[PDB]
Structure 1
Amino acid sequence: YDIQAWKKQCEELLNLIFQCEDSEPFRQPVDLLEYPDYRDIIDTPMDFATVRETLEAGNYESPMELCKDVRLIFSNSKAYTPSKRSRIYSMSLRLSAFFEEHISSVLSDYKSALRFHKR
């Protein structure tokens, strides 16, 4: 029932994601000079270094907010490269499955702790 436990759990899951080779294209913002039409398609760029920095700055109130930003990394990649046969699409699907598999208990434990607090 630890209301704060999600933060270190998210730091550890981000460490695992950075160690995955599938995270390479997502570790820093998409270079706005290599893909000059990126902002024509993507309104809100997102990447794992921005997520880690937002978490470390104390600028997420809950793991649901972190989860929303991570899901935005994958929806941005699917919008910019829609081909299910592209290198980035297949890496996105694998990394997203890994992330969702691990974030599920973090969200459940956080929500359970808040319900216990307000019992």
Structure 2
Amino acid sequence: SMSVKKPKRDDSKDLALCSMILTEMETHEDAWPFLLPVNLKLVPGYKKVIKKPMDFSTIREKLSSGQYPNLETFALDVRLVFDNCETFNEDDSDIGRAGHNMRKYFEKKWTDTFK
């Protein structure tokens, strides 16, 4: 409260660390469904069903241009990618499997880097 501060995280390295994590996701061999935005013109149903599309290149642009206020808003966008993937794809599809794999991969990096 007013004039009563908790000790808080050293967050000075967060930008560099999120960038490193994003690089590792960009270079994962199962990253191919998530590298670019889904083509809303050519993929039936996607525009109407998926209210907030998100992909790695869009996250990269936002990270490079100061559009994440903190590391949690960054993690929300990464999770959005995989949440969207689960909404639109069968768990047994290649893309569905890719999504589950990448989520697991991300969350371990996240825990190991910040928790």
Q: TM bucket by the smaller chain?
A: 0.7 to 0.9
Q: Which has the higher helix share?
A: 1
- Aligned: 1:88 with 2:114: no
Is residue 2:102 matched to residue 1:104?
Answer: no
Q: For 1:35, what is the secondary structure of its paired residue?
A: coil
Does 2:39 align with 1:36?
A: no
Matched, 1:60 2:68: yes
Aligned residue number for residue 5 of structure 1: 13
Q: Which has the higher contact order (CA 8 A, sep 6+)?
A: 1
Q: What is the percent sequence identity of the aligned residues?
A: 31
Report the Cα distance in structure 1 between the residues aligned to 2:93 and 2:111, rounded to whole angstroms.
27
Alpha-carbon separation, structure 2, partners of 1:97 and 1:60? 22
Task: Report the Cα distance in structure 1 between the residues aligned to 2:68 and 2:88, rounded to whole angstroms.
Answer: 26
Which blocks of at least 5 consecutive residues in structure 2 are unaligned? 1-8
Q: How many residues align?
A: 107
Runs of 4+ more than 4 Å apart:
none
User: Partners of 1:66 and 1:105 in 2: how far apart?
Assistant: 16
CA distance in 2, matches of 1:45, 1:21: 21
TM-score (norm 2): 0.87
For structure 1, the residue ranges without an aligned partner over 5 or more in a row are 109-119
Q: What's the CA shift string for 1:67-87, capped at 9, x where partnerless?
A: 000100001011111x22111
